[PDB]
């Protein structure tokens, strides 16, 4: 076996001496220019994609939905503007201007128009809408009224489900206003066989159709839609091939001209055919990544195990230098930051930070249970250190057999303060996936979707961020006998003041949860039926088993595994609150039910000055908190979470799949706390809620190992759509080789104690405050929000302040 230049930087740093602190290499000037063109780019709204898809719909009213969507994607691939940026080796642009956003009106449209003037200036994720762009979208939007997926989904929902959503119990906005996404497709298949191979599987499947029944008629419509879609897709790359050549014929720099000529050649081979060089393999990867998000605005299109399916193309390519390979990976990380997505101004504040959540993980196990580290694994950590942009949502998997090298190199990278990589624990995830019926071998191949949601890749329709659900709000409502303000949203579970024990409250809590989770499932499933009836996707579907084999889209159940995953909010908030009641009322009998009720309704006297309240606030504010290794309060948080996770688990979706709870906040634990009044934990009305399964802001006081011991007491296995735990560290506390060993020691402890995930900010309290006071000088400060990272200066100030609010850990 001969030497390969992907080793040339590990015979240094890992196989040649040199204690745990090793530093990172520097990107080429080219990577630095590309990196900056993204940072300084002003995000616009563009019209070309929306108008082209609107026209495809008008011209094809009579086709079945699956063929209409093929006509949509063929018109867009054949006519969308083809843009190649200065300096890029990997080409393919969703928008003309960098880091801009298409509009997808097939899902929803009217907030875009309602917001033509206000979007340039709104608090969260503003975009610039040129006047000409507004006009063309105004003309396009005249087609859509009642013709959207959202409008259909609303008319499947009962009036009580919609009341509960109006009043902050829960929301299904994500897949209601936009596409689904949340998937890790079969990149490897396209790498080996290409779009042409996909076309050929479909010809074979079409030639073996059983035609002795009515069942062949729609399946044939699906197969023809696929073939048409990938004919347009092959065309889309040829279109880039041709513009590379046109740029090459007029380019004055000879080495840039030679690059452009090579890009043209690349786009002539891939993705239509299997890739033959690492450069092609990256171009295939990026064509898939971008084209998917042209076809639909669904985010969390996650590269997944990109170190595994790309590595064979790197090993075969002995021609290229170490640093060119690494430069190709860097351009891939920068292209990933070109994608953007606008949402209505309330949803923007929940997915804040120009974020499309495209998660990429490295390491882990093979399907045979062996460690899967390879040289590309490390090159991906290097690329993150080179580019230091919010995307990709870079990630590592960890198991008992993880090399210390890889956990130490990952910790070393985390210590840069970007929030990446996040860390996910095979030893909990694999068992959790098998419990939802994923096969052991498919389970071992898991990657992470979006923030923290695990999935057997190219095998799953996951719906991993279907809904946001406020467990704090359900507590509020349980204590007010099923009303929220002047609206009866839940059943009558007796008035609070007539509880005799904690048995009476838990039974009341279970009945409310059972009522609202059922409404959640209805709202979710109504969205599910609507995407199936009006927007099945022939392009996406071809890249997930077993769509092609079954002749059905992902939207109508062709995947092997099928899930729907709604997200709990305010878990620590709820558990601490329930515990305060349990000791400050029923055990220490230190205030009574009727004064709590009055204290809540009064908001602890935040306008009175009533000292019985401003001080039974203190009695509750100072009760034992989740996150301090105290079994009393931690097991109550375990129980409150299990109450949500065990209801969710009971339901099924129209694709033949199970609902499964996740626990993660994306950037909405501020926004959604506004929907809850004063709480028994002494939290005041409309105050933020706890991110993920993290303890409440600032109430874990016995240090990072006590906190992590608490979180691990929760049932992470049953929240198989994924849990999220944040920690923030003082940077001085992790410096040096003593820092890295403490740091890896913590992660090891937390994962052996069967938590699913953890990630870290590593930053000085004054660095964040400075970015606040002086935004124009900290454009590039990237920190971790929750399961993803963002430019801290684009976050609304109150989400900024919630990040500052978080407990600072020290060893």
- What residues act catalytically? 451, 453
Instruction: Indicate the residue among 17 and 213 with the shorter CB distance to a copy of itself.
Output: 213
Instruction: Give Cα 499 to chain centroid, integer Å.
Output: 40
CB of 53 to a copy of itself, least distance (A): 16
From CA 53, how far away is CA 369, in angstroms rounded?
45
Q: Between the CA of residue 59 and those of 69, 109, 252, 328, 434, what are the distances in Å?
A: 12, 19, 43, 41, 46
3-state class of 5 per DSSP?
A: coil
Instruction: Indicate the residue among 229 and 266 with the shorter CB distance to a copy of itself.
Output: 229
Q: Is residue 528 close enough to count as binding a copy of itself by CB under 8 A?
A: yes
Instruction: Indicate the residue among 148 and 478 with the shorter CB distance to a copy of itself.
Output: 148
Q: Quick one: which segment of 46-54, 85-93, 287-295, 517-525 binds a copy of itself (CB under 8 A)?
A: 517-525
Instruction: Indicate the residue among 191 and 527 with the shorter CB distance to a copy of itself.
Output: 527
Contacting residue, 654, 703, 731, 775, with a copy of itself by CB under 8 A: 654
From CA 266, how far away is CA 767, in angstroms rounded?
44
From CA 558, how far away is CA 220, in angstroms rounded?
14
CB of 514 to a copy of itself, least distance (A): 11
What residues contact residue 334 under an 8 Å CB cut-off, 6+ apart? 31, 34, 35, 38, 88, 387, 389
Sign of the C-alpha dihedral computed for residues 411, 417, 420 and 422 taken in this order: positive
From CA 757, how far away is CA 396, in angstroms rounded?
10
Q: Is residue 152 close enough to count as binding a copy of itself by CB under 8 A?
A: yes
Contacting residue, 13, 116, 156, 324, with a copy of itself by CB under 8 A: 156
From CA 248, how far away is CA 237, in angstroms rounded?
16
Give one DSSP letter per residue of 366-423, joined into a string.
Answer: -TTS-B---HHHHHHHHHHHHH--S-SEEEEEE-TT--HHHHHHHHHHHTTSS---EE
What residues contact residue 716 under an 8 Å CB cut-off, 6+ apart? 428, 432, 693, 723, 754, 755, 756
Q: Is residue 74 close enough to count as binding a copy of itself by CB under 8 A?
A: no
3-state class of 583 per DSSP?
A: helix
For the window 129-148, what string marks contact with a copy of itself as x by the rule CB under 8 A?
----------------xxxx
Q: Is residue 108 close enough to count as binding a copy of itself by CB under 8 A?
A: no
Q: Is residue 437 close enough to count as binding a copy of itself by CB under 8 A?
A: no
Residue 378: name the closest of 317, 435, 460, 314 by CA. 314
Q: Is residue 159 close enough to count as binding a copy of itself by CB under 8 A?
A: no
Contacting residue, 56, 82, 154, 387, with a copy of itself by CB under 8 A: 154
What residues contact residue 776 under an 8 Å CB cut-off, 6+ apart? none
Tokens at 560, concatenated? 């092997």
Contacting residue, 17, 62, 208, 776, with a copy of itself by CB under 8 A: 62
Tokens at 261, concatenated? 């000529």
Contacting residue, 155, 255, 486, 776, with a copy of itself by CB under 8 A: 155
Q: Is residue 651 close enough to count as binding a copy of itself by CB under 8 A?
A: yes
- Residue 363 phi, psi (nearest 5): 70, -165
Q: Quick one: which segment of 132-140, 151-159, 374-382, 402-410 binds a copy of itself (CB under 8 A)?
A: 151-159
Instruction: Indicate the residue among 221 and 460 with the shorter CB distance to a copy of itself.
Output: 221
CB of 62 to a copy of itself, least distance (A): 4
Q: Is residue 255 close enough to count as binding a copy of itself by CB under 8 A?
A: no
CB of 459 to a copy of itself, least distance (A): 21
Sign of the C-alpha dihedral computed for residues 101, 104, 108 and 114 taken in this order: positive
Task: Check if the beta carbon of residue 392 is closer than 8 Å to that of residue 289.
Answer: no
From CA 568, how far away is CA 665, in angstroms rounded?
8
Which parts of 26-80 are beta strand (E)?
none
Q: Is residue 583 close enough to count as binding a copy of itself by CB under 8 A?
A: no
Contacting residue, 2, 23, 61, 503, with a copy of itself by CB under 8 A: 61
From CA 669, how far away is CA 799, in angstroms rounded?
9
Q: Write out the binding residues for a copy of itself, residues 178-217 only, by CB under 8 A.
A: 211-214, 217
Instruction: Indicate the residue among 518 and 741 with the shorter CB distance to a copy of itself.
Output: 518
Instruction: Indicate the residue among 63 and 128 with the shorter CB distance to a copy of itself.
Output: 63
Q: Is residue 511 close enough to count as binding a copy of itself by CB under 8 A?
A: no
Contacting residue, 315, 316, 529, 702, with a copy of itself by CB under 8 A: 529
Q: Is residue 67 close enough to count as binding a copy of itself by CB under 8 A?
A: yes
Instruction: Indicate the residue among 269 and 658 with the shorter CB distance to a copy of itself.
Output: 658
> Which residue bears the tokens 């870290």?
760
Give one DSSP letter per residue of 485-499, joined into a string.
Answer: TTEE-S-----GGG-
Q: Is residue 64 close enough to count as binding a copy of itself by CB under 8 A?
A: yes
Instruction: Indicate the residue among 398 and 520 with the shorter CB distance to a copy of itself.
Output: 520
CB of 654 to a copy of itself, least distance (A): 4
Instruction: Indicate the residue among 531 and 728 with the shorter CB distance to a copy of itself.
Output: 531
Q: Quick one: which segment of 5-13, 56-64, 386-394, 785-793 binds a copy of itself (CB under 8 A)?
A: 56-64
Task: Check if the beta carbon of residue 660 is closer than 8 Å to that of residue 648.
Answer: yes
Q: Is residue 525 close enough to count as binding a copy of itself by CB under 8 A?
A: yes
Count of residues of this chain found to bind a copy of itself when the rule CB under 8 A is applied:
37
Q: Write out the binding residues for a copy of itself, residues 360-389 only, by CB under 8 A.
A: none
Going by DSSP bridges, is the β-strand pair 726-729/561-564 parallel, antiparallel, or unpaired?
A: unpaired
Contacting residue, 653, 694, 710, 809, with a copy of itself by CB under 8 A: 653
CB of 138 to a copy of itself, least distance (A): 19
Breaks (C-N over 2.5 A) in the chain follow: none
Instruction: Indicate the residue among 177 and 354 with the shorter CB distance to a copy of itself.
Output: 177
Task: Check if the beta carbon of residue 536 is closer than 8 Å to that of residue 654.
Answer: no
Contacting residue, 108, 151, 266, 721, with a copy of itself by CB under 8 A: 151
Q: Is residue 522 close enough to count as binding a copy of itself by CB under 8 A?
A: yes
CB of 552 to a copy of itself, least distance (A): 15
Sign of the C-alpha dihedral computed for residues 599, 601, 604 and 610 taken in this order: negative
CB of 540 to a copy of itself, least distance (A): 22
Q: Is residue 221 close enough to count as binding a copy of itself by CB under 8 A?
A: yes
What residues contact residue 166 under an 8 Å CB cut-off, 6+ apart? none
Q: Is residue 510 close enough to count as binding a copy of itself by CB under 8 A?
A: no
> Given the rule CB under 8 A, which residues bind a copy of itself?
60-64, 67, 145-148, 151-152, 154-156, 158, 211-214, 217-218, 220-221, 518, 521-522, 525-526, 528-529, 533, 650-654
């Amino acid at each position: 076996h001969h030497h390969h230049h992907s080793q040339d930087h590990e015979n240094l740093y890992f196989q040649g001496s040199m204690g745990l602190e090793k530093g990172f290499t520097h990107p080429t000037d080219r990577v630095v220019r590309l990196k900056n063109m993204i940072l300084h780019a002003k995000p616009y709204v563009e019209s070309e994609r929306a108008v082209l898809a609107t026209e495809a719909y008008k011209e094809n009213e009579q086709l079945p939905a699956i063929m209409r969507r093929a006509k949509v994607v063929e018109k867009i691939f054949n006519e969308l503007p083809v843009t190649i940026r200065p300096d890029e080796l990997i080409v393919g642009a969703v928008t003309i201007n960098p880091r801009s956003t298409e509009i997808c009106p097939e899902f929803s449209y009217d907030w875009v128009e309602k917001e033509f003037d206000t979007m340039a200036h709104r608090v969260a994720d503003p975009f610039i809408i040129e006047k000409k762009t507004a006009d063309e979208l105004h003309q396009a939007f005249k087609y859509w009224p009642g013709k959207t997926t959202s409008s259909l989904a609303a008319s499947y929902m009962s009036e009580g489900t919609k009341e509960s959503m109006s009043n902050g119990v829960f929301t299904v906005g994500n897949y209601f206003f936009g596409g689904i996404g949340h998937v890790s497709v079969d990149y490897g298949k396209v790498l080996k066989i290409g779009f042409r191979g996909i076309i050929d599987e479909v010809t074979r499947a079409l030639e073996n159709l059983d035609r002795s029944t009515s069942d062949y008629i729609k399946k044939e419509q699906f197969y023809n839609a696929v073939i048409l879609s990938y004919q347009a897709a092959i065309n889309f790359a040829h279109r880039y091939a041709q513009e590379a050549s046109r740029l090459a014929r007029e380019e004055r720099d000879p080495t840039r001209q030679r690059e452009l000529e090579q890009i043209a050649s690349n786009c002539t081979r891939v993705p239509e055919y299997g890739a033959t060089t690492f450069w092609e393999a990256c171009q295939t990867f990026w064509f898939i990544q971008s084209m998917l998000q042209i076809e639909s605005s669904g985010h969390s299109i996650s590269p997944g195990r990109f170190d595994q399916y790309m590595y064979p193309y790197l090993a075969a390519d002995t021609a290229i230098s170490s640093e060119f390979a690494q430069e190709l990976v860097d351009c891939c990380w920068i292209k990933l930051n070109d994608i953007n997505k606008t949402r209505d101004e309330i949803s923007a504040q929940a997915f804040a930070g120009y974020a499309v959540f495209q998660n990429l993980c490295v390491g882990g196990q093979t399907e045979d249970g062996r460690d899967a580290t390879n040289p590309l694994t490390y090159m991906c950590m290097e690329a993150t250190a080179h580019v230091r942009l919010p995307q990709p949502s870079f990630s590592i998997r960890v198991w008992q057999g993880t090399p210390d090298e890889f956990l130490y190199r990952a910790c070393e990278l985390v210590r840069l303060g970007l929030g990446v990589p996040a860390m996910y624990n095979d030893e909990v995830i694999i068992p959790a996936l098998q419990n939802r019926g994923v096969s052991l071998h498919d389970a071992r191949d898991y990657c992470i979707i979006g923030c923290v949601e695990p999935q057997a890749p190219h095998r799953t329709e996951g719906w991993h961020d279907a809904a946001f659900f406020n467990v704090a709000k359900v507590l509020e409502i349980t204590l007010n006998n099923g009303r929220s303000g002047n609206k009866q949203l839940g059943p009558m579970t007796g008035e609070m003041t007539q509880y005799a024990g904690m048995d009476d409250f838990y039974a009341a809590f279970k009945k409310q949860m059972a009522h609202f989770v059922h409404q959640l499932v209805e709202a979710c499933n109504s969205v599910d039926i609507a995407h199936g009836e009006r927007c099945p996707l022939p392009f996406l579907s071809a890249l997930v088993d077993d769509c092609i084999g079954r002749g059905k889209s992902l939207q109508e159940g062709g995947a092997i595994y099928n899930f729907t995953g709604p997200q709990a909010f305010g878990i620590a908030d709820t558990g601490d609150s329930v515990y305060a009641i349990q000791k400050q009322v029923f055990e220490d009998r230190r205030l009574t039910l009727q004064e709590l009720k009055g204290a809540l309704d009064a908001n602890f006297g935040y306008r009175s000055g009533n000292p019985r309240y401003e001080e039974i606030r203190h009695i509750l504010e100072n009760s034992p908190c989740f996150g301090n290794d105290i079994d009393d309060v931690d097991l109550v948080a375990r129980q409150c979470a299990l109450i949500y996770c065990q209801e969710v688990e009971k339901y099924t979706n129209p694709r033949g799949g199970r609902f499964q709870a996740g626990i993660y906040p994306v950037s909405a634990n501020v926004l959604f706390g506004k929907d809850v009044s004063a709480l028994p934990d002494g939290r005041l009305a409309k105050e933020p809620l706890a991110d993920g399964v993290s303890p409440r802001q600032g109430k874990d006081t016995l240090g990072p190992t006590a906190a992590a011991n608490s979180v691990a007491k929760l049932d992470h296995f049953i929240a198989s759509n994924g849990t999220l735990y944040n920690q923030k560290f003082l940077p001085s506390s992790l410096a040096g080789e003593k820092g890295l060993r403490n740091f890896g020691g913590l992660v090891r402890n937390y994962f052996d104690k069967k938590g699913m995930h953890v990630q870290f900010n590593v930053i000085d309290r004054n660095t964040l405050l400075e970015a606040q006071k002086n935004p124009q000088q900290h454009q590039d400060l990237v920190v971790r929000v929750a399961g993803y990272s963002a430019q801290f200066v684009v976050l609304a100030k109150e989400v900024q302040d919630d990040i500052i609010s978080r407990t600072e850990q020290q060893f």
